[PDB]
Write a protein that binds this DNA or RNA. Sequence first.
RNA 1: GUCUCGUAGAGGGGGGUAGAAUUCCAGGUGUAGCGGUGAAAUGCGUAGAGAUCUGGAGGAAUACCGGUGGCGAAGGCGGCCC
RNA 2: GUACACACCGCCCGUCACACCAUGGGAGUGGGUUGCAAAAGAAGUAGGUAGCUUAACCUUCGGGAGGGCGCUUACCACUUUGUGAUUCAUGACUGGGGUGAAGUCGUAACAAGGUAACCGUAGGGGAACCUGCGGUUGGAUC
RNA 3: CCGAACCGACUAAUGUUGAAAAAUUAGCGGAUGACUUGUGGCUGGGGGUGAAAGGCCAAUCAAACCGGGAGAUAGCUGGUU
RNA 4: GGAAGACCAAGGGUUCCUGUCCAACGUUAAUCGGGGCAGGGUGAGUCGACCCCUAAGGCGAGGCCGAAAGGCGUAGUCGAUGGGAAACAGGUUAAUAUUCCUGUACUUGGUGUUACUGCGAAGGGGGGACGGAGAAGGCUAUGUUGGCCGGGCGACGGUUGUCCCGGUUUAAGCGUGUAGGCUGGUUUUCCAGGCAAAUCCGGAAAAUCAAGGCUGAGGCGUGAUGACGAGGCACUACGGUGCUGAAGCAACAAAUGCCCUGCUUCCAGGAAAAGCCUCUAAGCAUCAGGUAACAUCAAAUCGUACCCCAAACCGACACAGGUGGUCAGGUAGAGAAUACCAAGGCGCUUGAGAGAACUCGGGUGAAGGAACUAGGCAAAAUGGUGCCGUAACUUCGGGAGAAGGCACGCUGAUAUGUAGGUGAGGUCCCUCGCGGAUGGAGCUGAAAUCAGUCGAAGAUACCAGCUGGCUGCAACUGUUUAUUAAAAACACAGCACUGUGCAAACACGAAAGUGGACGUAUACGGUGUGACGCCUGCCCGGUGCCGGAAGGUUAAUUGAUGGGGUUAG
RNA 5: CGGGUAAGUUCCGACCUGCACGAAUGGCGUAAUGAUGGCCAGGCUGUCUCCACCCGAGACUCAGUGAAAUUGAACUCGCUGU
Lengths: 271, 46
Amino acid sequence: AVVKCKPTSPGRRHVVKVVNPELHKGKPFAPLLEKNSKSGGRNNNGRITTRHIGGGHKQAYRIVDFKRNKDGIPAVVERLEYDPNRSANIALVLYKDGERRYILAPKGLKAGDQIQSGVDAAIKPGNTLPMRNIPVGSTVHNVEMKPGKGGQLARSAGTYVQIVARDGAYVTLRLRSGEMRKVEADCRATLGEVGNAEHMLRVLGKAGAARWRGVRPTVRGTAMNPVDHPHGGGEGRNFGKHPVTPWGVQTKGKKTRSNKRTDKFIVRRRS
Amino acid sequence: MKRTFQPSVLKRNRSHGFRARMATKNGRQVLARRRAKGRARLTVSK
RNA sequence: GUCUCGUAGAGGGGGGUAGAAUUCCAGGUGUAGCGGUGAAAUGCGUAGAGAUCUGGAGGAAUACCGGUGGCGAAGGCGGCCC
RNA sequence: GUACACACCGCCCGUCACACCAUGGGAGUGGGUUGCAAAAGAAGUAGGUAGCUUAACCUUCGGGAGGGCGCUUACCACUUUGUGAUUCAUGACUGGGGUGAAGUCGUAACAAGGUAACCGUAGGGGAACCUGCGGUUGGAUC
RNA sequence: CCGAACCGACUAAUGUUGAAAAAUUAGCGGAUGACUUGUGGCUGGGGGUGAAAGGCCAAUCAAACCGGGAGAUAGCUGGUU
RNA sequence: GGAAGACCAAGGGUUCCUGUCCAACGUUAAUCGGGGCAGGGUGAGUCGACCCCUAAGGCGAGGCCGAAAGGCGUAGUCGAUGGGAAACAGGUUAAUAUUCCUGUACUUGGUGUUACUGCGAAGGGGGGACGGAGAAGGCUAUGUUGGCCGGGCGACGGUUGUCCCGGUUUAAGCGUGUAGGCUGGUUUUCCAGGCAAAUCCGGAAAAUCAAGGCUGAGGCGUGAUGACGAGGCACUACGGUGCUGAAGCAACAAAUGCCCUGCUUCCAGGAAAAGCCUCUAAGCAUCAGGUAACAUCAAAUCGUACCCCAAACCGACACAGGUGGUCAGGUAGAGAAUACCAAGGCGCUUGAGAGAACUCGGGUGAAGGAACUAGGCAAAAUGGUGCCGUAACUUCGGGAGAAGGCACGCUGAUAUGUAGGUGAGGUCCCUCGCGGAUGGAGCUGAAAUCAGUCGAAGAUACCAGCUGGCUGCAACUGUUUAUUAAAAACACAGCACUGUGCAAACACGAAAGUGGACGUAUACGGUGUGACGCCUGCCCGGUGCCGGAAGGUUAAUUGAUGGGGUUAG
RNA sequence: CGGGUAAGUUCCGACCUGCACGAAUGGCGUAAUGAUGGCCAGGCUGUCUCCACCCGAGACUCAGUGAAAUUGAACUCGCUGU
Ligand SMILES: [K+]
Ligand SMILES: [K+]
Ligand SMILES: [K+]
Ligand SMILES: [K+]
Ligand SMILES: [K+]
Ligand SMILES: [K+]
Ligand SMILES: [K+]
Ligand SMILES: [K+]
Ligand SMILES: [K+]
Ligand SMILES: [K+]
Ligand SMILES: [K+]
Ligand SMILES: [K+]
Ligand SMILES: [K+]
Ligand SMILES: [K+]
Ligand SMILES: [K+]
Ligand SMILES: [K+]
Ligand SMILES: [K+]
Ligand SMILES: [K+]
Ligand SMILES: [K+]
Ligand SMILES: [K+]
Ligand SMILES: [K+]
Ligand SMILES: [K+]
Ligand SMILES: [K+]
Ligand SMILES: [K+]
Ligand SMILES: [K+]
Ligand SMILES: [K+]
Ligand SMILES: [K+]
Ligand SMILES: [K+]
Ligand SMILES: [K+]
Ligand SMILES: [K+]
Ligand SMILES: [K+]
Ligand SMILES: [K+]
Ligand SMILES: [K+]
Ligand SMILES: [K+]
Ligand SMILES: [K+]
Ligand SMILES: [K+]
Ligand SMILES: [Mg+2]
Ligand SMILES: [Mg+2]
Ligand SMILES: [Mg+2]
Ligand SMILES: [Mg+2]
Ligand SMILES: [Mg+2]
Ligand SMILES: [Mg+2]
Ligand SMILES: [Mg+2]
Ligand SMILES: [Mg+2]
Ligand SMILES: [Mg+2]
Ligand SMILES: [Mg+2]
Ligand SMILES: [Mg+2]
Ligand SMILES: [Mg+2]
Ligand SMILES: [Mg+2]
Ligand SMILES: [Mg+2]
Ligand SMILES: [Mg+2]
Ligand SMILES: [Mg+2]
Ligand SMILES: [Mg+2]
Ligand SMILES: [Mg+2]
Ligand SMILES: [Mg+2]
Ligand SMILES: [Mg+2]
Ligand SMILES: [Mg+2]
Ligand SMILES: [Mg+2]
Ligand SMILES: [Mg+2]
Ligand SMILES: [Mg+2]
Ligand SMILES: [Mg+2]
Ligand SMILES: [Mg+2]
Ligand SMILES: [Mg+2]
Ligand SMILES: [Mg+2]
Ligand SMILES: [Mg+2]
Ligand SMILES: [Mg+2]
Ligand SMILES: [Mg+2]
Ligand SMILES: [Mg+2]
Ligand SMILES: [Mg+2]
Ligand SMILES: [Mg+2]
Ligand SMILES: [Mg+2]
Ligand SMILES: [Mg+2]
Ligand SMILES: [Mg+2]
Ligand SMILES: [Mg+2]
Ligand SMILES: [Mg+2]
Ligand SMILES: [Mg+2]
Ligand SMILES: [Mg+2]
Ligand SMILES: [Mg+2]
Ligand SMILES: [Mg+2]
Ligand SMILES: [Mg+2]
Ligand SMILES: [Mg+2]
Ligand SMILES: [Mg+2]
Ligand SMILES: [Mg+2]
Ligand SMILES: [Mg+2]
Ligand SMILES: [Mg+2]
Ligand SMILES: [Mg+2]
Ligand SMILES: [Mg+2]
Ligand SMILES: [Mg+2]
Ligand SMILES: [Mg+2]
Ligand SMILES: [Mg+2]
Ligand SMILES: [Mg+2]
Ligand SMILES: [Mg+2]
Ligand SMILES: [Mg+2]
Ligand SMILES: [Mg+2]
Ligand SMILES: [Mg+2]
Ligand SMILES: [Mg+2]
Ligand SMILES: [Mg+2]
Ligand SMILES: [Mg+2]
Ligand SMILES: [Mg+2]
Ligand SMILES: [Mg+2]
Ligand SMILES: [Mg+2]
Ligand SMILES: [Mg+2]
Ligand SMILES: [Mg+2]
Ligand SMILES: [Mg+2]
Ligand SMILES: [Mg+2]
Ligand SMILES: [Mg+2]
Ligand SMILES: [Mg+2]
Ligand SMILES: [Mg+2]
Ligand SMILES: [Mg+2]
Ligand SMILES: [Mg+2]
Ligand SMILES: [Mg+2]
Ligand SMILES: [Mg+2]
Ligand SMILES: [Mg+2]
Ligand SMILES: [Mg+2]
Ligand SMILES: [Mg+2]
Ligand SMILES: [Mg+2]
């Protein structure tokens, strides 16, 4: 549910929380945990290569099954859990043979539900099939781009993909961006939408709430000196130039896609 | 007031010690130079 | 006022679906106009429009039935199916 | 059909300009009344009583009882302080309203008033108003 | 929220061949957080890092320090027994 | 005296102790010294390092990449600031001590017996193993008072008592298993999981029992017929030694330490690997190996002095500076503030006079009270707790400690000490205990009311908000010019535009790669704006960006055609 | 122009003649917040009228130790002129 905080202090007045009473309150499933230490946005030259990253809360990595290739064996949802690594929630599922795995939690999935993968799985939310076996027009998520590679599209909270057509070895998908994209029909997809759609309704409310998430402050280029940024300089607030990135490329409409290798799969760009 | 030299023997040896000098060709040229000058103490190594 | 049996109904809420049409996209044929008005012009068109054929996308509304017909406290309620 | 009757060469709307009148807002300000919280404590009455002083009663003649004065405490009028409420007056400037008079700008309404009018709402416009959406007939023609 | 430790540095006086190449004294702000601190690690000079002051990068910064090209060049100033 | 005491890490390196000397060093003198010279001094199976294990990160066989130098990285190997066995009390030196001595312990390993016996890993599973905040209860450290024991009878009125002073200490280990915390137990059968196997973990289905296990402070017992112990006595080379030794209990208060890696709750969702336990594979088979008891041996090496908020470290100085961790007594107090003290440590390495101007740091001030000045700068002032009471405005939280006001010491009574807390004996019960119930002796003890009483003054010192009215800017908490600027600047939650379909855009990089991200459009980058409320109008001619592609123009490339040189003729 | 003052180039409220505001290099408001800028009042005072006295540390004298910047050379006065 979406809950406004009461304004008992200035840093709380605008906070809006997403509170889900169904998420597990205890610890995660340890055999599927890994450590995952932070980067500060720095690569192996030790240089900052993505600005505005650092700090925030310590986080363990949950191994999530994006391939969904344990075919023919049913699993039951044991519990939903918070995952710090992503916007979606995850579900711990127990297979009939006694194996446990984490999956992205689809909308509507709850403890006790049954799921299955494979060519013969039923058309139900949480089931995974090759898109060859999914009716045209369906809504799916966690879509593979190459067969067997694992889900890569529509994984964020509340997202989904529409299967709009099927021609030969390929299906045409409408992505969340609005792009129409061809993908091999042997690629798998999970029925339904990714859950936690209220994610986008939260309001951080204060500066520190962004710092808790590992985001460091953004300094506007127009607030700098010319040596630092093309926008810098001026006696007072001055601008007088076409907006650019810190490295000089126009940043208000100039397109940057240049991938002739994958152009053949884009039926229609998002705009 | 806190001054610039805050000693630590581990940091001294890791930064400037004999084995650190021997690890790169530029550090071995430091040692070659100091031997040619005839320094009594080649490095910080105690 | 309660119960029994039946009757008509665009009464309400939820879900699904169908056909016509408009627009847009692609392609075929085709060539100098189209559109609009009281008359015009802006606009669109040789970078091939308008017209005509095929395929696709999408939203909204449900021709005929239809009725000084019906239902609902009023506001209001109209394809079909559950 | 009509809001016309010196009868459409009729009637009539609003801004703007001019004059006068009452009124709302207004940095505030100045009076009246009053709430609350305290401070204050004349006189009086009541309680207490170191100290002082006593006609009637009792004395074993020394005094005792009782009284008075003084002092003190309680209650309380004047008065004082702080902060509210309410009411009256007033205020540069400003909002609309009424009346008069008719100058300037148009012609919104009354006939189908020349785009039927009106209602709620929203946006726009020197002004009457115009436009969208739903609604009404208190619409002429057919 | 009030307030010590701890982290700061708004005002004044002193000090200015200082006790100190940035402090002392009286006051001052934060004080469960975008907090503070120990140890170790990583980023290197047209480069780093920067809640951005051209700030900081060993009392050095509109391009660090050390060595070299090097006796750069100096239509300028001084000096020339 | 929450240090100017005690003790570590770091850093230093003989500064430590003793004798001796006073040139130089010491801001003066110096017989003294962290100074000179000489001698002495650091004792470990248990403390630390080394060691086993890993984090960030480093290096890195082959490898991939790069003119060379080199860059990245796999298997690996390093790397603590983190995980991993074990010792305490007393005594002793001029100088070391958990290291020496006395007493009493514990750990790991090698051997060898004995008894019994499926052992076996580079593999599987478990465990190790983890956040913030908050709330209590049970405790101990520790303190206070009483009792006890020893001593005292007071330089000046009084002091045989309801008087004064001191002491009243004891560990690890071993045994016991309590307040509390967590979890149902046991036995069969079966199985697509745990790269193979598995009796282990996971899963499924039954039967049966309902209490079984795990964890755990403290207390109690033992350790201890010991040790220590006020003092006494005897010697001193008057520094100190030698000898002996009483009581050694209770109640109450009580941590920020322990139970607690708990419990409750929240979102920002909280290392790793080994030691450890367990499972089997290859293999081994009356062998090895495993388990237990007993014996015996081993536990090396290096550090250990001394300073450590400092005269020994970082600041050129015996420099008002800087420096992480641990300990935490009394009275008042909310307190680690503050005042006065304890233990303990110090008077800061020039002094002696004088009592001018002037400077510095402070105290008080007649009448006036901001007239000062750029400006109330500075100063003065306010200041506590409880209660009464508190406006506009407001985002309904605030504003607010608004403002303003009253009470406050001591003594007695209520009540020989109250409400409350704590809780003994006794008594009862028991599934007999570190038990329940009852009962309340003793101990501790607010706050209030009434009466009285002293002073000019009772929040008496130290300590400890000045308040209100109008307005600009920025929403707010934050950040910044180390060393003249703290702000209206930067950031910020929120908003918008725009890029980006994943081998993402983008960034570091001749490259390999790496970050973005083990993320996937509810995501990530760039840019502007800057909570929130009401809003955000017109202009696409210029510059940019986006789309278009018929025509004009146009590169390398191609080399038609024309012209020339040469000369067989 | 109004308010506040005995007196107000600042302040507050208005007017509009905006040299040269204006809508996310945002416009206009805004409770709360600020070692932020301006203005007013009560309290308070040595800030001041206008300073006085006092307590300490220097200054001064004696003993000990013992610097510095600077410096062509000096037997280093005023005035009026040059
Ligand atoms: K999450
Ligand atoms: K910013
Ligand atoms: K700029
Ligand atoms: K600027
Ligand atoms: K500037
Ligand atoms: K270093
Ligand atoms: K019905
Ligand atoms: K008026
Ligand atoms: K008024
Ligand atoms: K009309
Ligand atoms: K009409
Ligand atoms: K209308
Ligand atoms: K106009
Ligand atoms: K930290
Ligand atoms: K820079
Ligand atoms: K340097
Ligand atoms: K440089
Ligand atoms: K000295
Ligand atoms: K002397
Ligand atoms: K005496
Ligand atoms: K030692
Ligand atoms: K004190
Ligand atoms: K003198
Ligand atoms: K009691
Ligand atoms: K206070
Ligand atoms: K604003
Ligand atoms: K500040
Ligand atoms: K700034
Ligand atoms: K608001
Ligand atoms: K708000
Ligand atoms: K334009
Ligand atoms: K343009
Ligand atoms: K802009
Ligand atoms: K705004
Ligand atoms: K400020
Ligand atoms: K202000
Ligand atoms: Mg960013
Ligand atoms: Mg993340
Ligand atoms: Mg931003
Ligand atoms: Mg700037
Ligand atoms: Mg530039
Ligand atoms: Mg400007
Ligand atoms: Mg300009
Ligand atoms: Mg009025
Ligand atoms: Mg009286
Ligand atoms: Mg009209
Ligand atoms: Mg009309
Ligand atoms: Mg109305
Ligand atoms: Mg219009
Ligand atoms: Mg129209
Ligand atoms: Mg700072
Ligand atoms: Mg200070
Ligand atoms: Mg504050
Ligand atoms: Mg505070
Ligand atoms: Mg260089
Ligand atoms: Mg500048
Ligand atoms: Mg510097
Ligand atoms: Mg340069
Ligand atoms: Mg040269
Ligand atoms: Mg030269
Ligand atoms: Mg020496
Ligand atoms: Mg010594
Ligand atoms: Mg000596
Ligand atoms: Mg001397
Ligand atoms: Mg001498
Ligand atoms: Mg000596
Ligand atoms: Mg010595
Ligand atoms: Mg490497
Ligand atoms: Mg190699
Ligand atoms: Mg490694
Ligand atoms: Mg290792
Ligand atoms: Mg360590
Ligand atoms: Mg010692
Ligand atoms: Mg105790
Ligand atoms: Mg004890
Ligand atoms: Mg006597
Ligand atoms: Mg004992
Ligand atoms: Mg014991
Ligand atoms: Mg604490
Ligand atoms: Mg020692
Ligand atoms: Mg000294
Ligand atoms: Mg010092
Ligand atoms: Mg410190
Ligand atoms: Mg204390
Ligand atoms: Mg103190
Ligand atoms: Mg004198
Ligand atoms: Mg004096
Ligand atoms: Mg003075
Ligand atoms: Mg004074
Ligand atoms: Mg005075
Ligand atoms: Mg006096
Ligand atoms: Mg006076
Ligand atoms: Mg006064
Ligand atoms: Mg004045
Ligand atoms: Mg003056
Ligand atoms: Mg002041
Ligand atoms: Mg003061
Ligand atoms: Mg207070
Ligand atoms: Mg107790
Ligand atoms: Mg102003
Ligand atoms: Mg601010
Ligand atoms: Mg500065
Ligand atoms: Mg400053
Ligand atoms: Mg990548
Ligand atoms: Mg801005
Ligand atoms: Mg004026
Ligand atoms: Mg004036
Ligand atoms: Mg003004
Ligand atoms: Mg502007
Ligand atoms: Mg402008
Ligand atoms: Mg605009
Ligand atoms: Mg603009
Ligand atoms: Mg703009
Ligand atoms: Mg702004
Ligand atoms: Mg602040
Ligand atoms: Mg002298």
